[model samples]
Target: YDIQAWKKQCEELLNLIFQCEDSEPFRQPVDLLEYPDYRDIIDTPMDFATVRETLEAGNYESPMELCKDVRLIFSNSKAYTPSKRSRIYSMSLRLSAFFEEHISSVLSDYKSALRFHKR
Candidate 1:
């Protein structure tokens, strides 16, 4: 019903992500020089550094939007990496799972539950 609590949750979740070892690659925008074709490949590149900037700017419409961008961090990385064998594939799963667990509480609460709450 209220939005501010979600923002608080979002910040807390991001802080937890930043604490993780797997988050290093996602903490900053990718250097195009190192990944010259990244723009063409991933299309809409995202990173925790820039996402945090956006979060501060209050760019997200909802927590779900935040989830999409965070997942995109893993998505863009996986799309460009070209291998399941790399530590990237393996660790990204755990990172993604960590995020998904946090977000599930938000996603399921507001949908079916909203009908009765609003009435």
Candidate 2:
């Protein structure tokens, strides 16, 4: 079994997330001119584009490494968005939940495959 297959599976999940409309806010960097204090408020900024960039460049060694940044995309949004009531805040939560749910099922499938091959 090739361990490298996990990255491709992660890429597949990322593409699915990209198709969700709620994921739009985190697809790119925030507008500094619109929110000048964004960099100051969020110590770690992450986005889907940035995550894809890292994934392509071979920076991520595992699904978890890629997912760490994926989670940050939402955590940064939660930190900077002024109110829990903001649509962006709730949308981020929803998207993260979607991602988490899908990823869990895939991993269990992978684990099943791992066991199936153990002989």
Candidate 3:
């Protein structure tokens, strides 16, 4: 695997994730089962609301675990195909890298919290 290419892909998805998370416009939920409802919407990509919700909840063991969970969540999407396939595959790859690079620090934070609360 091209590490830089993979990293670029990861960065692109990270940018999308940030855009999805921070933007007020893409905040609304979309029902993939209802085609007519989604058919009218233009330029709106896959729903990241669930992904964002999971991140916002912030209760994962490590970034690696979180990335896998995110991939699973995305793979379960009605709009997307199976895992290790096209869009989801690319998303998963990029997500894994992004989480590894950025969110992995969350594990240490959790460790500290656990230390404080273990009593």
Candidate 4:
């Protein structure tokens, strides 16, 4: 695995969330584990289910908090010496694409649900 490239992809993924319009409220968390394409890596240390549960359970107040957990997971020594090294890069790429492809749709759906609930 190209560690530098993996780090870059991680940065881009974080930026994609952090750079969202300031006018938009960051509420409902995005569950990256929801994607079948990312099933293989959805339960890792910094995986989607962990983050979503952290947010929903009130342990985390925002996506940025989840991002901090993710960064920690990635920084761990186990993440660097995964048993399946090649798969690590592929999984990371899938995660990046998963966020890029699904975040907007997920947030939109959540917003719509909130609007419905407010009625």
Clashing pairs in 1: none
Q: Which ten residues in a row have the lowest lDDT in candidate 2?
A: 105-114
What tens-digit string does per-residue lDDT give for candidate 1 at 1-119?
A: 55356777778888999999988777888889987887888888888988778888989867778888888898887898878877867778888889898878876664445555677
The lDDT values for all models are 0.80, 0.84, 0.46, 0.44
- Each model's TM-score? 0.85, 0.85, 0.40, 0.35
Which residue runs of candidate 3 sit more than 4 Å off their true CA positions? 1-16, 20-47, 51-71, 74-85
Instruction: Point to the candidate with the largest lDDT.
Output: 2
> Which residues of candidate 4, in runs, are more than 4 Å off?
1-45, 71-85, 104-119
Give the alpha carbon lDDT tens digit for every residue of 6-45 in model 3. Answer: 2233335556666532333233454557544544433334
Q: What would you estimate as the lDDT of candidate 3?
A: 0.46
Ranking by lDDT: 2, 1, 3, 4
Report the lDDT tens digits of candidate 2 across residue range 73-92.
98898889889999988999
Spell out the clash pairs found in candidate 2.
none
| Residue 51 accuracy (lDDT) in model 4 | 50
List clash counts for every candidate, in order. Answer: 0, 0, 0, 0
> Over the stretch 43-116, how does candidate 4's per-residue lDDT look in tens digits?
43354445545555667533344556755443332344346465544454445445647445434554565567
Clashes in predicted model 2: 0
